[PDB]
Amino acid sequence: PSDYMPEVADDICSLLSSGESLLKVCKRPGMPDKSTVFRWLAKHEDFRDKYAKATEARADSIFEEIFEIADNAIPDAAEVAKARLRVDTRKWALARMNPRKYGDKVTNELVGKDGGAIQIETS
Amino acid sequence: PSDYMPEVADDICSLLSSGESLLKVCKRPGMPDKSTVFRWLAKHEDFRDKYAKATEARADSIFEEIFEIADNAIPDAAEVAKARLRVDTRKWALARMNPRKYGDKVTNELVGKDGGAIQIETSPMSTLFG
Amino acid sequence: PSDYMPEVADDICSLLSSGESLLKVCKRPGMPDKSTVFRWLAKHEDFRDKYAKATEARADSIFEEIFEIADNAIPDAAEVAKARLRVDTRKWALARMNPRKYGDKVTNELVGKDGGAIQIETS
Amino acid sequence: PSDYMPEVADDICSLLSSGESLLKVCKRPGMPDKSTVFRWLAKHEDFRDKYAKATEARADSIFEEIFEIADNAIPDAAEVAKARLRVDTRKWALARMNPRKYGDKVTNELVGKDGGAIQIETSPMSTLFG
Amino acid sequence: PSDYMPEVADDICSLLSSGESLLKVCKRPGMPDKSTVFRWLAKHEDFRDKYAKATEARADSIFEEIFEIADNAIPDAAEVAKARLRVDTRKWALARMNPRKYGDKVTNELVGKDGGAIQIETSPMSTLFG
Amino acid sequence: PSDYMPEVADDICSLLSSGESLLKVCKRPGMPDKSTVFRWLAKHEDFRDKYAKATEARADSIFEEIFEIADNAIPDAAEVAKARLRVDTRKWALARMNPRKYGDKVTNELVGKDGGAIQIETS
Amino acid sequence: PSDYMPEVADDICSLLSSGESLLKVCKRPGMPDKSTVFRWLAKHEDFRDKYAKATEARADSIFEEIFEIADNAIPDAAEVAKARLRVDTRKWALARMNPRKYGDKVTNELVGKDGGAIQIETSPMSTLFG
Amino acid sequence: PSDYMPEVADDICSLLSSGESLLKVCKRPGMPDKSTVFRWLAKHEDFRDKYAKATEARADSIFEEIFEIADNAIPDAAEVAKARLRVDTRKWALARMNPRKYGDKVTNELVGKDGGAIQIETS
């Protein structure tokens, strides 16, 4: 299949929301390929809408998945290394799926020379 | 369990508050699967509010837990690597669960050229960037 | 036990102050569980007060503990790796227990293009 | 193939859009070598515009691919190290292919001395920095 | 030793000034335990002031010590890893003991779009954030 | 050879553009040495021009090279370590060859205390 | 060689310009020891100016050298680790030799709360910080 | 010895300038101990002067030392690890000995949302 289908568009959003990679999604029988989905993502606002939301939902699912990957890692060198890679990939990706929620968090206390006020000279 | 059940939702919040992760909670007897919990969250504001509070408590619980995971790590290479992964995952997650409390902390002493004042020159716009 | 007790609240602050994790604290006979303590932390300002101070005191204790963990590490691969993890966990936690004191420290010399003045155009 | 051929250029854009890297594409049958592609880019605006669009699509494709590379890594030390290298290279590249979407994300809570307001003192210039 | 004893406190300050850590100092003959030292600090301003000075001196001493720990490390894997841990711990601690002297140092050349001036557009508040 | 030659200057830019290190370039028969090239880079604006452009072109070539180095690494510990070093060196260098294009990318959401407005007091 | 000798100083500048490090240069036949070179630098402005130029050239030379060190690394664990150390040392040094050219490069897209404008509230000073 | 001596103060500055750690300096026969030197550093401006300069000179010496440590490292795992630690310690220390010269260097291109102008609202 490779034609626009609202019912598969929905079906797509559901699997994504559950955390499943789009690759592992389209790889399903009767489903549009990645390329087609990205094509639709440029010809269906009604889709781009259900996709952005599904992406934030997918992130929330992945957030819980990282605890399981870390905690249930097989205590073998290569397996722990693989688990670390799976977790690091997800952490990095979550920040891009929902920046406001999963991006880095820093509090910067801004002070001037020697802890005094910030000194500025203007021209 | 597919239908929204307040009593089970309440239990979920209590377990999360104590530091347990959602996927682990959903494996307990009589608990809805994760997909179902997210669905409940999506359609029940009462649960969302209580879950947000549970998330704050969960972070405070994990903050104490990371000391235990590190200190009690079996002194075996792979076991220490796994303990490190479990701690790093929690550290990262804590900052997102409560950014104000658990985000990074930096004090930046801001100075200018050669340790003097910060030198700023303002000029009229040279291009149409408005 | 699981009722409010000012005497155990104090007892709690003491162990914390010495650097002991709350987990290893409540784990003591007759002591309230973590959950209860966090509950109290929302029903006793008189407690929230003695707890915030105890947390800064606990940090000061942990600060000295990291030198001992590093310097007395058994010179074996896994043991040194464990010692590093114990130290890294404490360093990260100290910044959160007392941000002004244990957070990162940076001095930024701010200059403009080519070392000249910072150039700004406003609209 | 040395002469600019729109049909081959179009194919290149489609392959890149799907996530394939340029050097790998140039190894396919009938494809121009990399140097030639860069030359085509240099002298054909039509190709440059379509290639820029293909780059955006390529990044979206690699973003999904990194999950697969990590999750399907053979659990062997060297194989995991290679998977990690393949993922780190893609992460770095994604930020450059689409900075807005894939660059780092940070929220900075800015406060001043002791958690109060940011203290700023302005003074007349003390040196000729204009 | 539980009662506050100025002479012992003075000794503690001298030892710390030379670079020794508090827990190691407290293991010496006749020294109060760490908990006791913190208690003394809490209730004797004279000791707190002298201890703060001792902390500055301690940092200057550790700054020289890190070169020695690195340079004299036994060339054995675990021994080098331990030396690295001892040095990293000291580096981190130095910045906190004397932020002005030992914090990170960065020079940021600040420029605007395309290397030109920093472009700023000011607008009236669009939301009630005051 | 060690005299100014526009034809070798061009020849130089070509190899660079293809991604080849200047070292591996001058190392070619009849070609000026590195030192001489850097000398020319201070006596031929017509050269400094064709060189800056060639450097940005070289970066674009290297950008594609890193995917090949990573993906085709021999799955052996030392070989993967070498591949990682080759890639890391190139990533670092690309940012310097074309800063606007290959430098780090960060989006900073700037907010004030507790997520409110940034509080500033001036004197 | 202890006395300042322009011809030897000139040679030093040429060697450094080509990428050689000072300690290695000082091991060559007839060269002054490092301490002596620093002494010459201290008291001869002519040498300092030429040495500063040589430093810029040295950095441009090392920039090309790092590709070679990485690409030609013997594929042996310790040899690759040493190559990595040699490259990391040069990267760090390059930024200091020519900060403008070799320092880190970052583009920061600055936005405010929720992706909107940066919200700033100014207030009268509440403490004597002038 | 443990009395103020201008001649040993000078002797001190010389060794430091050559890059030698103060520890390895005082450890010399007839020389004041570290503690005493730090004491003098608070009772002799004439000393604090010759010391700050010596520290910047020491940094310049150490800067050249790191190339030698890296390039001449014995190609053995532990020896390379030790060499890396010696170099990392020196890099970190150089930034503190001369911040303006050896501190980190970053050029930040500051832009606003979507690459447009930086948007600011004031109250």
UniProtKB/TrEMBL annotation, chains B, D, E, G:
Organism lineage string: Viruses, Duplodnaviria, Heunggongvirae, Uroviricota, Caudoviricetes
Protein's name in the database: Gene 1 protein
Molecular function (Gene Ontology), one example: identical protein binding
InterPro entries per record: Sf6_terminase
Organism: Shigella phage Sf6
Pfam family, one: Sf6_terminase
